């Protein structure tokens, strides 16, 4: 990670983005610049080689240019499948491979309200002596979301962990999973377990809850 790229870039479907790559004299200045696309969970795939050239398979929506110690990747006609990390690459003064830090592409779309689901702990986990409560926020945009756990109307803090998927390949939305974990003993000292969700697409906070023992 020697070359400099912007942390992220964003535009709407059908629009155009450009990702710059800033190096110096010894690398980008003297040598050819390559570009890669890395979809989440996959190996990097080359889009551009020798500053400007596309290998077979790569659509002409992708293009590249080089000017001094700076290179640029261009993506025209954005599609929802274009969400990925994009790296620039070249050779250093010793002709060894060097890469940029990467750039996250985010497709800008219309605001989407999250679907909220909640999952009581399973009997199998209960038998082991633990209770994990899961709250699902499905297919929303933008990314920001507030999830608050309430146990008998007591707000939980530092008691839960969440993670967010990468932007969906179809509708460019996000999903969020929050897990609240209690000991079996503590789980059986309370009745109402609730998940409270705040999002831009929600006129008011949505709450999903269950009582211990009804499932």
């Amino acid at each position: 990670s020697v070359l400099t790229q912007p942390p992220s870039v964003s535009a709407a479907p059908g629009q155009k983005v450009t990702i710059s790559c800033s190096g110096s004299s010894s690398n980008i200045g003297n040598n050819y610049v390559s570009w890669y696309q890395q979809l989440p969970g996959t190996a990097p795939k080359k889009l551009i080689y020798d500053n400007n050239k596309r290998p077979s398979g790569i659509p002409d929506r992708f293009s590249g240019s080089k000017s001094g110690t700076s290179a640029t990747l261009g993506i025209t006609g954005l599609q929802t499948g274009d969400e990925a990390d994009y790296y620039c690459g070249t050779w250093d003064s010793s002709l060894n491979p060097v890469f940029g830090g990467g750039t996250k592409l985010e497709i800008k779309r219309t605001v989407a309200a999250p679907s909220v689901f909640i999952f009581p702990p399973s009997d199998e986990q209960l038998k082991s002596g633990t209770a994990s409560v899961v709250c699902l926020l499905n297919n929303f945009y933008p990314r920001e979301a507030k999830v608050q756990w309430k146990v008998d109307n007591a707000l939980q803090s530092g008691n839960s962990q969440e993670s967010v998927t990468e932007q969906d390949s179809k509708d460019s939305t996000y999903s969020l999973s929050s897990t609240l974990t209690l000991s079996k003993a503590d789980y059986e000292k309370h009745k109402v377990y609730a998940c409270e969700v705040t999002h831009q697409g929600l006129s008011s906070p949505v709450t999903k809850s269950f009582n211990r023992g009804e499932c």
């Binding site: 990670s1 996959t42 190996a43 990097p44 795939k45 080359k46 080689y49 290998p55 790296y87 690459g89 010793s94 060894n96 491979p97 060097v98 890469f99 940029g100 830090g101 990467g102 679907s115 909220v116 689901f117 909640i118 999952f119 009581p120 702990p121 399973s122 199998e124 986990q125 082991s128 994990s132 899961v134 699902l136 499905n138 962990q161 969440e162 993670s163 967010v164 998927t165 969906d168 999903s175 969020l176 999973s177 897990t179 974990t181 999903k208 269950f210 009804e214 499932c215």
Partner: protein, 218 residues
């Protein structure tokens, strides 16, 4: 032409990481070069080393004292040795090669360097019910809990089910163990009839679990 790294695993501090890359559909002596590139979690790409047509090798200067890259012509594979590892060597390692213009990449293998030990996951259902029902759509999933190290792979109905599937990034719990959830949204009418199984594979512990997810009685 396909490249395939050895499966994901765990390496203790200060021992020697060993990886192999099986080349398929191409003789290994007919390539320009073969090499390794690693990528730390959430970070960019780092070149490790390459071995060339003649056998001449070039290594990353900051790693050169610990790196050995060799080629097994008979097995048609090439290797990577990295000794005296620390937690800073935790990364997805890719093998790559140029054959005859873009190189051929392996799919990558996550190597974790930690003084913690290997543990297979427990798989609990995220059972569907009225609580996970929104209109005509119902949500269900699997909770893959208490494993180490990463990664795990989750598929639904042996890959037959892919639409509406969301597998979330794992989280590191305070116990030092990972926990992961994988969900899918299906028609509410299917809950009674259609069978839903999440296929879980934790290669570092050689743990595989096929877990049926049945509706909850609320």
């Amino acid at each position: 032409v396909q490249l395939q790294e050895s499966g994901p695993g765990l390496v203790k501090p200060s021992e020697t990481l060993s990886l192999t890359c099986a080349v398929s559909g191409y003789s290994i002596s007919s390539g320009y070069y073969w090499g390794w590139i690693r990528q730390p979690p959430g970070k960019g790409l780092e070149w490790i080393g390459s071995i060339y047509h003649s056998g001449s090798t070039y290594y990353n200067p900051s790693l050169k004292s610990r790196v050995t890259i060799s080629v097994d012509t008979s097995k048609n594979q090439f290797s990577l040795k990295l000794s005296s590892v620390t937690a800073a060597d935790t990364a997805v390692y890719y093998c790559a090669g140029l054959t005859q213009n873009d190189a051929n990449w392996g799919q990558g293998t996550l190597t974790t360097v930690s003084s913690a030990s290997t543990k297979g996951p427990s798989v609990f259902p995220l059972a569907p019910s009225s609580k996970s029902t929104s209109g005509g759509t119902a949500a269900l999933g699997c909770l893959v809990k208490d494993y180490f190290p990463e990664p795990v792979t989750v598929s639904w109905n042996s890959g037959a089910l892919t639409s509406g599937v969301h597998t979330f990034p794992a989280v590191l719990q305070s116990s030092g163990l990972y926990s992961l959830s994988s969900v899918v949204t299906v028609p509410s009418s299917s809950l009674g009839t259609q069978t839903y199984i999440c296929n879980v594979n934790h290669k570092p512990s050689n743990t595989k679990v096929d877990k049926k997810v049945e509706p909850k009685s609320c």
